[PDB]
Paper text:
Here we report the crystal structure of a Class A β-lactamase PenP from Bacillus licheniformis 749/C with fluorescein conjugated at residue 166 after E166C mutation, both in apo form (PenP-E166Cf) and in covalent complex form with cefotaxime (PenP-E166Cf-cefotaxime), to illustrate its biosensing mechanism. Enzymes of this family deactivate β-lactam antibiotics by hydrolyzing the conserved β-lactam moiety in the antibiotics and rendering them ineffective to bind to their target proteins, the penicillin-binding proteins (PBPs), which are essential for bacterial cell wall synthesis and survival. For narrow-spectrum β-lactamases such as the PenP used in this study and the clinically significant TEM-1 or SHV-1 enzymes, Ω-loop is tightly packed onto the enzyme active site through hydrophobic and electrostatic interactions with residues lining the catalytic site, posing as steric hindrance for binding of second- or third-generation antibiotics with bulky side chains attached onto the β-lactam nucleus. Exploiting the proximity of Ω-loop to the antibiotic binding site and its structural flexibility, we have successfully converted a β-lactamase PenPC from Bacillus cereus 569/H into a biosensor for β-lactam antibiotics by mutating the catalytically critical residue Glu166 on the Ω-loop to cysteine and conjugating an environment-sensitive fluorescein molecule to its reactive side chain thiol group to form PenPC-E166Cf as reported in previous studies.
Cefotaxime was soaked into the PenP-E166Cf crystals by incubating the crystals in the reservoir solution with 0.01 M cefotaxime added for 20 minutes. The cefotaxime was clearly visible in fo-fc electron density map as covalently bonded through its carbonyl carbon atom C7 to the Oγ atom of Ser70, which represents the acylated ES* adduct. But we could not identify any electron density in either fo-fc or 2fo-fc map that would be accountable for fluorescein molecule around the location seen in PenP-E166Cf or anywhere nearby. Furthermore, the fo-fc map showed strong negative signal for a large segment of Ω-loop (residues 164 to 174) and the 2fo-fc map showed no electron density for this region at all, indicating this region became highly disordered upon acylation of cefotaxime. Based on these observations we did not include fluorescein molecule or the disordered region of Ω-loop in our final refined structure of PenP-E166Cf-cefotaxime. Fluorescein is seen as occupying a site that partially overlaps with the acylated cefotaxime; particularly the benzoic group of fluorescein molecule is in direct steric clash with the 7-amino substituent of cefotaxime. Thus the binding and acylation of cefotaxime to PenP would displace fluorescein from its original position to avoid steric clash. It is likely that the Ω-loop, in order to accommodate such displacement, loses its well-folded structure and becomes highly flexible.
Residue numbers in the entry: 31 to 57, 59 to 83, 86 to 163, 175 to 238, 240 to 252, 254 to 291
């Protein structure tokens, strides 16, 4: 309704699913249409990862070299000298979206097929880490796999804590969902971006009064060197909320 108003306003396509937990209402707008997850997968990569380590294991310092650097390393290039420890890598990857840090977390849980096999294992048959479907997923499946990790029971209580934390203190999205949501309202999020003007944010939002909603906004464009505008995430979000309230 309003959603289409913004896809002509920002010349883009919007993927949207919100679900309100306490009550199950839903806001949906192209929820099953594919969009590349781009870096929002870093949230899910870490949900697996905690499945797989004690919180001591996460202290295991990790040594790497300047060859492991790719195109965005914003924390990780500060260190190839010292080294950084897996918790440190969870943090950088999620709060900063460091790509190198993702790369390493991956190579720990045994990479894209291992992660696949692991997402299939919590009910996710859409998400697709390797008319192209390689590396794309849907507003739907992303909210439902994020909820499994951070709100349901796919993690033990104390790991589930650290995820959130990492996602509350994200630095990468205050122009996006965190912008559509009033002062006083927690969001934990992980943001994405790529060419063809993909810009994504997924998130849990908590409104001082009882149960959280969980929300994915996705978008892209036309046209491969397109650039993206953040305020499309923010208004998309203001509608989802009202929509909801
Ligand atoms: C997040 O999505 C991750 N993205 C990338 O490195 C890029 N593409 O990945 C397929 C990328 C950077 S810009 C472009 N054309 N492609 C990191 N995340 C963010 C973010 O805000 O979450 C970035 C702004 C870029 S790097």
């Amino acid at each position: 309704d309003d959603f289409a108003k913004l896809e002509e306003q920002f010349d883009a396509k919007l993927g949207i699913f919100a679900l309100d937990t306490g009550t199950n209402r839903t806001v949906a707008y192209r929820p099953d249409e594919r969009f590349a997850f781009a870096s929002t997968i870093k949230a899910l990569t870490v949900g697996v990862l905690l499945q797989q380590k004690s919180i001591e294991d996460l202290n295991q310092r990790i040594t790497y070299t300047r060859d492991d650097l790719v195109n965005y390393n914003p924390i990780t290039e500060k260190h190839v000298d010292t080294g950084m420890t897996l918790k440190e890598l969870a943090d950088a990857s999620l709060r900063y979206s460091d790509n190198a840090a993702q790369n390493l977390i991956l190579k720990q849980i045994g990479g894209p097929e291992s992660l696949k096999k692991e997402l299939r294992k919590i009910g996710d048959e859409v998400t697709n880490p390797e008319g192209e479907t390689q590396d794309t997923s849907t507003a739907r499946a992303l909210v439902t796999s994020l909820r499994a990790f951070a709100l349901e029971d796919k993690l033990p209580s104390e790991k589930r804590e650290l995820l959130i934390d990492w996602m509350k203190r994200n630095t990468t999205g205050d122009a996006l969902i965190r912008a559509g949501v009033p002062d006083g309202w927690e969001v934990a999020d992980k943001t994405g971006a790529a060419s063809y003007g993909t810009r994504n944010d997924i998130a849990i939002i908590w409104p001082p009064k009882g149960d959280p909603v969980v929300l994915a906004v996705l978008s892209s464009r036309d046209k491969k060197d397109a650039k993206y505008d953040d305020k499309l995430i923010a208004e998309a979000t203001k509608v989802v909320m009202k929509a909801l309230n």
